[PDB]
Symmetry: D4
Subunit: 158 residues, 8 copies
């Protein structure tokens, strides 16, 4: 468990790395009041313990022409492995960044990104709705990004 593996300073480590993910061990060492050796040791425990799963470069969709962030609610037909064949193909679609099996009226909620609405129609008509397992889709689109952080809260571990 994290209270019997992650002490106060490790939590600050993940807090800083979550936000400035490309620091060097020494930059981080300066950031958490620690000698470069044990700091490195700690950041290695966390990476091997599964806590830090990935370091990534986050981009601006608008800058790379992606104007239309769509949240699509999908329902899967009662077929053999409709679930798994949908799941298999959703991982192959680069435009679809995330997919989740949700509670409620919808079975699946997908988070996608596209350039313009024409782009989106060809994907919805020719890929999503054309897929044997996909029974019905409902697409909504983002009008304003009020908030967007990859950072999880860690004060519950304290």
């Amino acid at each position: 468990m994290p209270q019997l593996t992650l002490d106060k300073t490790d939590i600050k480590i993940l807090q800083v790395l979550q936000e400035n993910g490309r620091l060097t061990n020494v930059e981080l060492s300066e950031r958490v009041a620690l000698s470069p050796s044990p700091c490195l040791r700690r950041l290695k425990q966390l990476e091997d313990a599964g806590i830090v799963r990935q370091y990534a470069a986050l981009l601006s969709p608008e800058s790379v022409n992606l104007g239309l962030q769509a949240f699509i609610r999908v329902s899967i037909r009662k077929a053999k492995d409709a679930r798994e064949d949908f799941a298999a193909s959703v991982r192959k679609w680069p435009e679809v960044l995330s997919c989740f099996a949700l509670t409620g009226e919808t079975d699946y909620l997908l988070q996608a990104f596209f350039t313009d609405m024409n782009a989106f129609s060809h994907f919805v008509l020719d890929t999503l709705l054309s897929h044997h397992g996909v029974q019905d889709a409902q697409s909504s689109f983002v009008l304003k990004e009020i908030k967007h952080t990859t950072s999880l809260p860690l004060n519950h571990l304290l």
Copy 2:
């Protein structure tokens, strides 16, 4: 504008953000000094907005990830207040104004359904701007990446 090599840099760094300039230069088929100019251009051009360490919710005890469908009152100071308030809720990671049935969509994280209940009943719904909420929960993470698609730039 940016060329096929600038698109290879971004594709690569989206997956391994911490990747070294030697390694990066190698995969993008460029020398160390010149390719490190592109990456600095790109960072200085805003294309790359942040470098982040992505964590595993299970590992840090956030075993409950929710999507909450919220709607604000027909008010002037309801819009900004809810926004200003969601920005200060660390449990709440993203928030969006959607088209369609619901006006706002929140994506947040919790430990247990108990943690959630206190948040929804004592923070969210008691916010003067919030008119109604409707929260669903993630049963199975089929796919989740922070990597944007870049083939359209080719």
Copy 3:
């Protein structure tokens, strides 16, 4: 059907709340002697009025923290209805099951330890059952009220 009296109702009304009372105690509550009281309580059991006595447990005390109310709708065949009802009775994590009016056709009441527990039940058991066409599940955030006790003032 058994013809009930004022004392007969008081007995039920006592038993529903404290169902482990000794007959000596139940007799003194409802203002009766053991012998008569015992014959009543037995007549009330005989009649089918009392269907069972039950020890009621605290869900959180036994690690079930997540209480799901699940709206199910079953496939349209002259078999899915009985198969689903048959399976529902074999599922111990589901306590109640009701065929309802309105949008949802079936309503289930189920208890689980965590949300991950639910995910296995819904994905691997409920929604893979040939009869189940769709599910919509909610969760209890706060128990405002929960009694097992039926009202009996309409009999007086």
Copy 4:
């Protein structure tokens, strides 16, 4: 912390709640005295909330089991007044604050539809904090038990 015979006792009593100590002990591979202690602890520990006689709705003329979905208007203490009122309504057996479209969900019992109409129109819908109500009725009780699952502790 509950062992194998602590759990089985709970299993036995959840079904046959009025057993003698002697016939309870016979059903758990335990002698009277030990079994009486293991039960005492379970009660003092909060595990056994109460012992209740379960009756038949049909038996006592209650032929209409309604599951009602009500929402509450946004006003100071509307939820507390609803809660406190629903606790003094004997026809209402249980009431839960829920995730999803509905704010609340009651399970009520009535002699017939006329009885229901009077409750809904002149007590539920007339309470100040009650904004809306959607009632549905049970057509067939496929399963009903009070007995919680306990095989997760084994």
Copy 5:
């Protein structure tokens, strides 16, 4: 031909279907002789489709009056089979094809909720054509009349 007096007739008979031609001829200001010519021509032109005795549903023990919204499976004949089956169900008084979410709306009467369940569960839902159903019940008759409006004809 539907001049004022022909409407004064229709209006009166809708309310008092049983009225004597003497009394009818009096309320519409006509000698009996032509009042009986006019009415017969209304009876034989189709206008008056039926004279009917309207009964109190509670009086004959049918307390439960339902409104069911039914959708037929989209195949061949199903539409006709559900139609013809609905015509042989005496508890179903009216059945309309409506616009909107639901495809058919049924008005039906029952003795009690138990009588309703048998019907929904063993007839309505078990009919090969019926895809699904959604039943709502009448808590109070605010108004009910068989009299059409006819002012527009004036």
Copy 6:
């Protein structure tokens, strides 16, 4: 709250279908003695069973081509419910009004000449009424069945 003789039901069954029948013609459709057939109505109508005898007309024949079913929800202000009731009673075009269970609070069954007639009613009368929060109107495309006759075999 009772049950009547086998042919006493027929009296109601016959009258519901042919309501302006002569007691002579009635006594011939129920196998009842001539004048004692008038005696039996003298017990039914003279009780509460028969509420009214009415002339049922053809909507199309009197120009009423459009029959709407309107789902109306009511504002929760002080006695807004009786206000609505008080007004639906006065609107001739609205034939029947019921307080339903489910999503919508009230259901109205109305008749109109054409859609323009419905617009004026909906905009200028229904939705402009102080108690009416929302309305949701659906129209009939085809009358599969319509009888004013109740089932009476539950009484045998």
Copy 7:
């Protein structure tokens, strides 16, 4: 009123597809001399059948590449209906607008450059209008068919 024959419906039908045709051409297609064709056409305008001659453009060709249908709900004020009507009429991007039956009270058809533009309109114009309670917007993914042409063969 006018009495339209097969020649006159042919006039309107040709004009509906080809609005700009020369009077000589029009008369050639519709089997009439220029002299009366001209009269008959002007009779259809003066009558009110021809309400407007218009050139219809391709949205994409004018960068308006985002067509939205918007379902709007007016709050219950007294003037809310007319205020919204008035403001709707001044909004050029909103081309048509309808009081519909059903769940939605108003249906709008609008054209925008792209979602950014759409966001500005909903957040800063539509939802900030005092009489507007709610907005549920959808977009066109594929234009299967779109004509201004009405069917007129029911008049024959």
Copy 8:
């Protein structure tokens, strides 16, 4: 591809409202000599900018007094989409059809003379089509606004 200028748009804006103008009448309005203006317009037609000149009619003048906005759901079988598309294109009472985002997959604009006409269509042609799973129809009570004119100022 052609670039549009301040004058070019005026030609667009004027034509959109007054479609049947003569070339002389258009020239003396956009600040262009008759000869240039002639060509420029033909290049806009040829460029796809102006897609069709139409005479627009009054529904109520030609007895089409029921405007239905229909929401259809297509059966997701083997290319049922193309079939519905191909037959929607033949149905004259249907002027427009769109693949929408959100609850419904399709949205139709239809025009009828009355409810009888609508019934005949929805029951015996639309819902009897093999690709059509569900249909949900509404009707306009009031046209607040209707223009064919697109906005063009975003090009200035």
